[PDB]
Amino acid sequence: METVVGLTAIAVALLIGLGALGTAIGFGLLGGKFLEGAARQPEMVPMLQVKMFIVAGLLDAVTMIGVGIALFFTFANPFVGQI
Amino acid sequence: ANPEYRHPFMVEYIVVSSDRGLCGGLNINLFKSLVKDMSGYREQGAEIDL
């Protein structure tokens, strides 16, 4: 029993840690270009914010799936019942 | 295409004359026309560089 429960804590750490690593770097890359565009054309900032939010939805999509499967493995673990 | 920068020349006298004789009023008609604008700048109270 102890192995499954112990290896489910490592699974949760990887699902949230790998997601956090990618999301942080992805917004550093996307946001950096949003500041470059806003400085060049300060009158287009209202349009650039909505376009950045469209991309933000795509960037975090799989990260949000992983963080929902990690809070499911934490509360009412699906693999404990299988054994 | 580059509204990011405005050169000072895009936001708010050199006089040409001859070196020799036989000019049929060429230089006189030019100075006569210049004095009208220099006088106008002094009605406005502005200093003039030539």
Swiss-Prot record, chain A:
Listed SUPFAM superfamilies: F1F0 ATP synthase subunit C
Gene Ontology cellular component terms for the protein in this record: plasma membrane; proton-transporting ATP synthase complex; proton-transporting two-sector ATPase complex, proton-transporting domain
Highest taxon of the lineage: Bacteria
Compartments it resides in: Cell inner membrane
Transmembrane residue ranges: 10-30, 53-73
Reversibly protonated during proton transport (site feature) positions: 60
MF-aspect GO terms: lipid binding; proton-transporting ATP synthase activity, rotational mechanism
CDD domains: ATP-synt_Fo_c_ATPE
Location (main, coarse): membrane
Membrane topology note: Multi-pass membrane protein
Statement: the UniProt record of this protein carries the keyword RNA-binding: no
Keyword entries, A-Z: ATP synthesis, Cell inner membrane, Cell membrane, CF(0), Hydrogen ion transport, Ion transport, Lipid-binding, Membrane, Transmembrane, Transmembrane helix, Transport
Subunit structure: F-type ATPases have 2 components, F(1) - the catalytic core - and F(0) - the membrane proton channel. F(1) has five subunits: alpha(3), beta(3), gamma(1), delta(1), epsilon(1). F(0) has three main subunits: a(1), b(2) and c(10-14). The alpha and beta chains form an alternating ring which encloses part of the gamma chain. F(1) is attached to F(0) by a central stalk formed by the gamma and epsilon chains, while a peripheral stalk is formed by the delta and b chains.
Function, as annotated: F(1)F(0) ATP synthase produces ATP from ADP in the presence of a proton or sodium gradient. F-type ATPases consist of two structural domains, F(1) containing the extramembraneous catalytic core and F(0) containing the membrane proton channel, linked together by a central stalk and a peripheral stalk. During catalysis, ATP synthesis in the catalytic domain of F(1) is coupled via a rotary mechanism of the central stalk subunits to proton translocation. Key component of the F(0) channel; it plays a direct role in translocation across the membrane. A homomeric c-ring of between 10-14 subunits forms the central stalk rotor element with the F(1) delta and epsilon subunits.
HAMAP family for the chain: ATP_synth_c_bact (MF_01396)
Family: Belongs to the ATPase C chain family.
Name of the protein in question: ATP synthase subunit c
Organism: Pseudomonas paraeruginosa (strain DSM 24068 / PA7) (Pseudomonas aeruginosa (strain PA7))
Swiss-Prot record, chain B:
Protein's cellular compartments: Cell inner membrane
Positions of disulphide bridges: none
Subunit structure as annotated in this protein's UniProt entry: F-type ATPases have 2 components, CF(1) - the catalytic core - and CF(0) - the membrane proton channel. CF(1) has five subunits: alpha(3), beta(3), gamma(1), delta(1), epsilon(1). CF(0) has three main subunits: a, b and c.
Purpose: Produces ATP from ADP in the presence of a proton gradient across the membrane. The gamma chain is believed to be important in regulating ATPase activity and the flow of protons through the CF(0) complex.
Family assignment from sequence similarity: Belongs to the ATPase gamma chain family.
Name of the protein in its database record: ATP synthase gamma chain
Species of provenance: Pseudomonas paraeruginosa (strain DSM 24068 / PA7)
